[PDB]
Design a protein around this ligand. Structure first.
Ligand SMILES: *[C@@H]1O[C@H](CO)[C@@H](O[C@@H]2O[C@H](CO)[C@@H](O[C@@H]3O[C@H](CO[C@H]4O[C@H](CO)[C@@H](O)[C@H](O)[C@@H]4O)[C@@H](O)[C@H](O[C@H]4O[C@H](CO)[C@@H](O)[C@H](O)[C@@H]4O)[C@@H]3O)[C@H](O)[C@H]2NC(C)=O)[C@H](O)[C@H]1NC(C)=O
Ligand SMILES: *[C@@H]1O[C@H](CO)[C@@H](O[C@@H]2O[C@H](CO)[C@@H](O[C@@H]3O[C@H](CO[C@H]4O[C@H](CO)[C@@H](O)[C@H](O)[C@@H]4O)[C@@H](O)[C@H](O[C@H]4O[C@H](CO)[C@@H](O)[C@H](O)[C@@H]4O)[C@@H]3O)[C@H](O)[C@H]2NC(C)=O)[C@H](O)[C@H]1NC(C)=O
Ligand SMILES: *[C@@H]1O[C@H](CO)[C@@H](O[C@@H]2O[C@H](CO)[C@@H](O[C@@H]3O[C@H](CO[C@H]4O[C@H](CO[C@H]5O[C@H](CO)[C@@H](O)[C@H](O)[C@@H]5O)[C@@H](O)[C@H](O)[C@@H]4O)[C@@H](O)[C@H](O)[C@@H]3O)[C@H](O)[C@H]2NC(C)=O)[C@H](O)[C@H]1NC(C)=O
Ligand SMILES: *[C@@H]1O[C@H](CO)[C@@H](O[C@@H]2O[C@H](CO)[C@@H](O[C@@H]3O[C@H](CO[C@H]4O[C@H](CO[C@H]5O[C@H](CO)[C@@H](O)[C@H](O)[C@@H]5O)[C@@H](O)[C@H](O)[C@@H]4O)[C@@H](O)[C@H](O)[C@@H]3O)[C@H](O)[C@H]2NC(C)=O)[C@H](O)[C@H]1NC(C)=O
Ligand SMILES: *[C@@H]1O[C@H](CO)[C@@H](O[C@@H]2O[C@H](CO)[C@@H](O)[C@H](O)[C@H]2NC(C)=O)[C@H](O)[C@H]1NC(C)=O
Ligand SMILES: *[C@@H]1O[C@H](CO)[C@@H](O[C@@H]2O[C@H](CO)[C@@H](O)[C@H](O)[C@H]2NC(C)=O)[C@H](O)[C@H]1NC(C)=O
Ligand SMILES: *[C@@H]1O[C@H](CO)[C@@H](O[C@@H]2O[C@H](CO)[C@@H](O)[C@H](O)[C@H]2NC(C)=O)[C@H](O)[C@H]1NC(C)=O
Ligand SMILES: *[C@@H]1O[C@H](CO)[C@@H](O[C@@H]2O[C@H](CO)[C@@H](O)[C@H](O)[C@H]2NC(C)=O)[C@H](O)[C@H]1NC(C)=O
Ligand SMILES: *[C@@H]1O[C@H](CO)[C@@H](O[C@@H]2O[C@H](CO)[C@@H](O)[C@H](O)[C@H]2NC(C)=O)[C@H](O)[C@H]1NC(C)=O
Ligand SMILES: *[C@@H]1O[C@H](CO)[C@@H](O[C@@H]2O[C@H](CO)[C@@H](O)[C@H](O)[C@H]2NC(C)=O)[C@H](O)[C@H]1NC(C)=O
Ligand SMILES: *[C@@H]1O[C@H](CO)[C@@H](O[C@@H]2O[C@H](CO)[C@@H](O)[C@H](O)[C@H]2NC(C)=O)[C@H](O)[C@H]1NC(C)=O
Ligand SMILES: *[C@@H]1O[C@H](CO)[C@@H](O[C@@H]2O[C@H](CO)[C@@H](O)[C@H](O)[C@H]2NC(C)=O)[C@H](O)[C@H]1NC(C)=O
Ligand SMILES: *[C@@H]1O[C@H](CO)[C@@H](O)[C@H](O)[C@H]1NC(C)=O
Ligand SMILES: *[C@@H]1O[C@H](CO)[C@@H](O)[C@H](O)[C@H]1NC(C)=O
Ligand SMILES: *[C@@H]1O[C@H](CO)[C@@H](O)[C@H](O)[C@H]1NC(C)=O
Ligand SMILES: *[C@@H]1O[C@H](CO)[C@@H](O)[C@H](O)[C@H]1NC(C)=O
Ligand SMILES: *[C@@H]1O[C@H](CO)[C@@H](O)[C@H](O)[C@H]1NC(C)=O
Ligand SMILES: *[C@@H]1O[C@H](CO)[C@@H](O)[C@H](O)[C@H]1NC(C)=O
Ligand SMILES: *[C@@H]1O[C@H](CO)[C@@H](O)[C@H](O)[C@H]1NC(C)=O
Ligand SMILES: *[C@@H]1O[C@H](CO)[C@@H](O)[C@H](O)[C@H]1NC(C)=O
Ligand SMILES: *[C@@H]1O[C@H](CO)[C@@H](O)[C@H](O)[C@H]1NC(C)=O
Ligand SMILES: *[C@@H]1O[C@H](CO)[C@@H](O)[C@H](O)[C@H]1NC(C)=O
Ligand SMILES: *[C@@H]1O[C@H](CO)[C@@H](O)[C@H](O)[C@H]1NC(C)=O
Ligand SMILES: *[C@@H]1O[C@H](CO)[C@@H](O)[C@H](O)[C@H]1NC(C)=O
Lengths: 445, 127, 127, 127, 445
């Protein structure tokens, strides 16, 4: 006969959910992500390739993207908790034009001081986007935006917004399965599986309509979507060639600090050196629209021989209608209409610098995670700032037309913030290993 | 010699020679700030210990503590699986076997528990 | 078959047949908010592990880990209890016996330690 | 009979007589305020459990769980230490020997693993 | 042949770092150290002597002194968190002399109240050290010191600053090694070692230039320093005979409570009963100048036949230039120039009461750990207060001479706050025991 035997350490697993902890090369100026407070990453992480193994992956039903979203939001609130809260800034502002160039406003207002029995009159420039008119005095009285919803917290100037890579590790007794299949679209059975204890360096680069400093495709422009035929689902496309984009804030402001209360001060922009200049972003036209042809032809495989048309975002909030990012301190808002403006036929070919210039707007009062209230005030960075980014992906949205036409339009959709993390975690899935196994054998001989 | 969990694709007969590599990794700053990252690490550390003890306690009551492989007195009921002793060990793998016995895993666990307990009281406790 | 702790009223000889049912229940949302309820659960989970390890470590040093019943080399001193072997195993229950050996429980625990270590050094460590 | 860690200065042969006194102390208000002192105590309790399990799991895979002393199948390679048996067990202490084998401690740990795993699969798992 | 054998419970250890928890005879009024929240100390703590064992100790590279510093600071902040924050106290103060005797100032100022639509004018005495003039108006219109840096938190009157002893215990699997060598200087190989699970009763007595209520030397005056020849290193000297010092606050003030806001009040000193009197500290001259000779001759061993000279501090902050302590509620600042004022030759011998009187200053606004901001306001203690302390050690600093002189000058240096803890933890060190051991033997017979 046969007897039942139990095995310990069997190599099996199941889908599960667990509390993943951070891991990074600790070392120094703190950052908003508090990476210095997590476990230090190992110098030679182990990665094992599972031979003969095939596993099913679902980037849209993954829990890592959802768990990471909560952690990023929690860290953002934790970093802003000890900083000064700008509650006295909600005062009547008297603004005038700076001595289009109406992007800035020279506002003057009353303010408190360390002495409770004394006040002070100060002045400081303010971007027009972060100002709302009261309308009682028409065009000479204003107030800070979102002042009627919550008091924004000034970001601590000692912490930087640099998105250093952070590795997501699983606790003992669990593992992170990695898919090494070439050109995997993020869904289905992976024919080349691998395992690792921690994910690669994930840079929490917050962006909209364009993935910056993200991973690059291996051999071909990959497209991902849970239902490509659907209209409400966002389309994630990964590029193979990183399209370099150079942004700059030519204005040279003078940072001025005013003590609004005992032991706390408010930082604002003083006068501008030189003259006003519009912020913008440059990108090579030859290399940029060349990728559009490759992106268009790749998209053509999912829609027959129809032509591909790129149009600017329909309209709505500034966060979703403009390419938002951050040059390590200043939040940009650039109009991508100069990029997604073309039509590509089935035989169309793209065929000097001629760099495309994208005008950009800047805001100080910002809501990162589209939450009501909980706003943050970004202090100004002194001097001119420049940041170069690697465009490795795009967030597209398909219009919901009749679809019987000979063409189909695509728009740069902001989607959800989770899409930024999902573009990097599509290759991972957490599983719970079951070391206990049971199998029969002719034992007791 | 493959690394951790590297024998997942090999057959059941060949995957059992690396049991120690998977069993060893079941549990692998002194201060704690209890922040966002600290709280997650604390839960992960506590969760890892519980998972290890959850499976270790079963081996303890089964009388197989400290053994990577052990045979019990519960005979194999063909109703659970009619696979032959050849294809099950030399052709089929553990991952495919986990989904077949998952329906009867709980019943087998209880059977092994009372079998060991009855045998313990039968041999020991002379009077 | 009674449930957990159901054999508390039965005699000693009959209560020892269900040891596994009580031994199995000694350890039985992934995220944690660490709130009022979360803090209590965290302490409860940690306390449970400590309690299990507290009793498990004693069996480890005693050389009885992985065994529900085990006999040691310490002879039974009549001073601790002069009751006969029949009435104790067939008439008295575990609850009544616990309050009798509570005075000598710690002394017996210590006596089992060197009794095992000395045996280990005598059999093992040939030179 | 000395207390805990009292045999640190005695020779190796005389230090093995008190192993139980050091092994028993590896883990020795119900509510928790989670304050400055509460957080430190919580980490200390969790750290103590991990340290105990870290060394206990090694004995489990090695097949020596529940044993204070155990002999494995790995022969002693003279390269690790060429000193005789009489001077090591009757003249040298554990502290001086720890700094000599520290270099080869990791290799010996791994060598004892497959040496036990292979034996398990060789004796058990008849087919 | 020989086979490898593993031993569990081997008596070995290694240097390590761990989270040490408190332990004290908890039982009642609370204290700033929150000793009631830690584990209760054992009634008969076990201590073992390691025969034939010698271990190396390094009081300067010990981690316990650093860990204790963080815990003490953390407890200080934790106790001040639930107390009322004196943010409205930052107002212009109109002061005049009390009806040298200019140590106090009778100030009058406006203040808030429970009714938000009402205000109140109050008055209260303030020490000249805790007040700074605005300089815009002479002879009046002062402001609280450190008001332009942070809002001090009023210490809760329900918690006392009594430094009850606290025992530092190690987690299971670790231990504290004690050095019992007679006259150990704190560094080197200890020829008499012992082990214990918890340290003796450590009293967090914060003091500067003098160690109060600390441990006493066993047989001879011990001197400790990482590098005695280094002029930039503090010198710790332990006395064998405790030099009793009697301090007193003869002023009898009347405590008055004014409600600055809903459910919170501010305590301050009202008028003085009788007349103004200077606070001071007494110490026996015969017993005080006797120890200096013993301290001088002991120091002479490290400098040949050179003479020893004692001089007051070379100026600086009041915390480091004066002997700061606390009589359980009032922070004293006594000048030690009357003590460290003498020269001792190679043959010099010291040879009635004649008690030495040390004038002292008192402050309410204080910064305990030299941190910017995070100040605290100590409420006044009603009635006359007296506290007797046992001087068991001194913190000395040697001037950077040219080394060719026939004398050596020493100054009472404040050093670092960690020196106070280091003077008591020099005899301990934490080690991690490795119960798993490996050794060969002719087994399997
Ligand atoms: C995608 O990834 C790229 C590449 O990493 C990012 O580009 C970098 O962006 C960071 C900011 O996010 C830039 O860093 C800043 O650069 C400035 C210039 O540095 C030069 O000058 C300094 C002396 O002033 C030299 O030491 C240095 O070597 C350079 O020659 C500095 O003004 C900034 O300093 C600030 O940070 C440091 C560190 O915290 C502080 O000590 C300073 O006080 C100050 O606050 C800063 O270092 C970096 O230069 C960019 N690199 C390039 C190649 O352009 C993109 O930002 C990223 N994209 C997105 C969207 O995240
Ligand atoms: C070095 O160590 C010495 C000796 O321990 C310390 O000296 C003691 O200092 C404490 C304060 O830190 C003194 O305690 C206070 O004494 C006052 C007088 O107490 C007398 O009267 C009461 C009532 O009749 C008697 O019970 C008592 O025996 C004395 O005869 C009181 O005003 C205080 O009580 C009030 O405050 C405490 C704490 O807030 C409350 O619990 C009480 O309910 C009450 O409100 C208090 O007891 C003590 O008297 C000092 N002893 C001596 C011998 O002088 C040094 O302070 C210490 N040095 C340093 C630098 O830390
Ligand atoms: C936003 O709007 C604010 C005002 O609301 C602008 O700030 C002011 O800008 C004006 C110019 O537009 C500044 O006035 C100019 O300052 C120059 C520098 O003056 C230097 O000399 C002075 C010598 O003292 C005499 O003059 C002063 C008055 O200025 C008297 O008080 C003295 O008694 C003496 O008579 C110094 O005081 C001064 O510090 C300099 O050394 C000069 O070119 C001009 O004569 C003119 O006065 C004015 O100072 C600014 N005010 C403040 C508070 O900053 C701001 O620029 C606007 N921003 C933008 C972007 O448009
Ligand atoms: C700091 O500076 C403050 C002032 O800024 C000083 O405080 C004042 O000190 C003066 C002088 O000591 C006090 O005035 C004195 O009070 C004595 C006691 O009063 C007696 O009469 C009271 C009733 O009469 C008063 O009230 C009625 C109305 O109800 C009026 O008509 C009267 O005119 C009186 O105001 C009784 O209640 C009380 O029990 C007594 O019988 C008295 O000896 C003197 O006549 C004199 O007025 C004054 O009260 C203090 N003010 C406050 C607010 O406390 C303070 O002392 C200074 N501190 C130091 C250390 O110098
Ligand atoms: C699974 O995918 C991996 C991706 O890295 C393939 O890796 C090979 O790695 C070696 C060593 O770097 C390279 O020289 C090979 O060129 C890689 N192969 C390819 C096809 O690019 C691995 O080969 C894949 N495995 C299978 C079975 O297809
Ligand atoms: C991603 O690739 C998978 C296959 O690896 C695609 O899944 C197939 O989708 C077609 C759509 O017509 C179905 O007929 C097949 O049955 C699907 N196969 C499986 C195994 O599910 C999936 O559609 C791809 N997604 C995208 C966005 O391209
Ligand atoms: C993807 O979405 C499409 C629609 O965008 C689904 O296909 C049909 O959608 C219509 C409505 O437009 C429904 O009435 C039909 O029932 C859908 N077909 C079926 C077979 O259910 C499609 O089902 C979605 N899912 C996939 C996997 O393609
Ligand atoms: C931004 O403005 C500041 C302030 O004018 C410039 O800093 C000065 O640069 C000049 C260049 O010759 C130096 O001589 C000065 O010492 C700098 N400091 C000051 C206080 O004037 C800075 O160069 C400007 N930056 C840019 C990019 O134009
Ligand atoms: C190590 O130091 C200790 C310190 O206490 C010495 O303790 C002896 O303790 C007994 C009992 O209290 C006293 O009567 C002795 O006088 C102490 N000895 C001395 C020399 O003071 C202990 O003797 C020391 N051990 C060694 C080996 O020197
Ligand atoms: C404490 O005592 C030790 C010896 O127990 C002293 O160690 C000496 O340190 C100096 C530093 O320059 C070395 O040159 C000597 O060689 C050391 N001596 C020995 C015997 O090792 C240490 O200096 C003493 N410290 C004090 C402050 O007196
Ligand atoms: C301790 O301090 C002494 C000086 O007090 C150091 O010895 C020399 O000091 C001079 C300056 O006085 C330096 O220029 C030399 O370089 C020092 N010598 C060496 C060999 O570095 C001494 O090094 C310090 N450290 C110790 C451990 O004694
Ligand atoms: C400090 O001054 C107060 C207020 O005058 C004195 O309090 C005395 O307390 C007793 C308690 O029974 C009362 O009967 C008296 O009326 C109060 N006043 C006087 C003048 O005695 C307190 O005694 C004073 N303390 C000192 C040390 O002088
Ligand atoms: C699994 O991979 C191994 C290693 O290459 C190979 O020997 C074996 O034949 C493979 N099995 C299957 C079923 O593909
Ligand atoms: C961009 O697209 C246009 C229109 O299709 C094409 O003629 C051109 O070659 C492309 N490249 C550049 C650099 O303009
Ligand atoms: C898109 O482009 C059109 C044409 O230039 C413009 O009118 C519209 O405002 C643009 N929309 C956005 C969101 O920029
Ligand atoms: C985007 O750019 C187009 C072309 O310059 C312009 O017509 C449109 O108004 C812009 N949209 C915004 C929001 O600035
Ligand atoms: C490509 O085909 C379209 C029709 O589909 C035609 O209009 C266009 O001129 C063609 N381009 C060429 C031949 O270059
Ligand atoms: C074997 O399994 C079948 C199906 O569940 C059951 O009816 C039968 O009683 C089992 N036999 C034994 C001996 O457990
Ligand atoms: C038995 O117990 C008695 C009473 O405590 C004691 O005196 C005696 O020594 C014990 N005998 C043994 C063998 O332990
Ligand atoms: C013994 O150790 C030496 C030195 O590391 C090594 O070369 C040799 O292979 C080892 N022998 C065995 C049998 O492990
Ligand atoms: C160690 O101390 C013991 C106890 O006094 C003694 O018997 C032994 O000889 C000592 N060994 C050495 C090497 O000093
Ligand atoms: C210790 O003190 C004694 C007097 O008790 C003294 O004679 C001796 O010299 C001192 N020893 C040292 C080493 O300082
Ligand atoms: C030390 O004190 C005594 C007693 O007051 C005094 O006679 C002696 O002169 C003092 N020492 C010196 C050197 O001043
Ligand atoms: C002691 O030395 C000092 C300094 O050289 C000298 O003035 C004094 O006279 C000496 N006296 C004695 C008693 O040796």
């Amino acid at each position: 006969n046969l007897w039942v035997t139990v095995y310990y350490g069997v190599p099996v697993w199941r889908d599960a959910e667990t509390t993943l902890f951070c891991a990074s090369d600790a070392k120094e100026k703190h950052n908003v992500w508090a990476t210095h407070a997590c476990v230090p990453t190992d110098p030679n992480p182990q990665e094992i390739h599972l031979d003969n193994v095939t596993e099913k992956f679902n980037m849209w039903k993954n829990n890592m993207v959802e768990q990471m979203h909560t952690d990023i939001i929690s860290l953002w609130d934790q970093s802003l908790k000890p900083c000064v809260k700008l509650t006295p800034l909600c005062v009547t502002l008297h603004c005038t034009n700076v001595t289009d160039r109406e992007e800035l406003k020279n506002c003057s207002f009353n303010m408190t001081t360390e002495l409770r029995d004394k006040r002070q009159k100060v002045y400081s420039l303010f971007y027009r986007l972060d100002i709302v008119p009261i309308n009682e005095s028409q065009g000479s009285e204003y107030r800070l935006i979102n002042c009627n919803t919550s008091a924004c917290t000034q970001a601590c100037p000692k912490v930087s917004f640099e998105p250093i890579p952070i590795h997501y590790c699983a606790p003992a007794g669990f593992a992170i399965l990695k898919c090494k299949d070439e050109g995997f679209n993020g869904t289905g059975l992976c024919k080349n599986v691998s395992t690792v204890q921690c994910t690669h360096g994930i840079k929490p680069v917050v962006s909209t309509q364009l993935l910056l400093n993200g991973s690059l495709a291996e051999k071909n422009i990959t497209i991902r979507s849970e239902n490509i035929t659907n209209n409400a689902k966002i389309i994630i496309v990964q590029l193979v060639q990183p399209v370099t984009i150079k942004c700059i804030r030519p204005n040279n402001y003078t940072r001025k600090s005013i003590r609004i209360g005992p032991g706390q001060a408010f930082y604002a922009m003083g006068d501008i050196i030189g003259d006003i200049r519009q912020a913008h972003c440059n990108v090579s036209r030859s290399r940029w629209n060349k990728t559009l042809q490759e992106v268009a032809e790749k998209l053509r495989t999912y829609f027959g021989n129809k032509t591909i048309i790129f149009a600017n975002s329909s309209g709505g909030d500034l966060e979703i209608t403009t390419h938002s990012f951050n040059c390590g301190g200043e939040f940009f808002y650039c109009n991508t209409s100069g990029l997604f403006n073309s039509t590509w036929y089935v035989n169309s070919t793209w065929n000097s610098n001629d760099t495309i210039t994208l005008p950009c707007r800047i805001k100080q009062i910002i809501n990162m995670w589209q939450r009501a209230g909980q706003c943050m005030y970004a202090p100004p960075i002194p001097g001119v700032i420049k940041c170069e980014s690697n465009i490795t992906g795009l967030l597209l949205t398909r219009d919901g037309g009749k679809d019987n036409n000979v063409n189909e339009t695509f728009r740069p959709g902001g989607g959800d913030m989770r899409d930024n993390w999902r573009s990097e975690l599509y290759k991972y899935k957490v599983v719970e290993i079951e070391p206990l196994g049971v199998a029969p054998t002719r034992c007791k001989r | 010699r493959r690394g951790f969990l590297g024998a997942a694709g090999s057959t059941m007969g060949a995957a059992s020679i690396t049991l120690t590599v998977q069993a060893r990794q079941l549990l692998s700053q002194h201060l704690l700030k209890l922040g966002v990252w600290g709280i997650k690490q604390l839960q992960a550390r506590v969760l890892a210990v519980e998972r290890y003890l959850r499976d270790q306690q079963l081996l303890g009551i089964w009388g197989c503590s400290g053994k990577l492989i052990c045979c019990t007195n519960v005979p194999w009921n063909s109703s659970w699986s009619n696979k032959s002793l050849d294809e099950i060990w030399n052709n089929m793998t553990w991952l495919q076997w986990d989904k077949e016995i998952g329906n009867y895993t709980q019943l087998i666990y209880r059977l092994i528990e009372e079998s060991q307990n009855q045998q313990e009281k039968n041999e020991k406790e002379l009077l």
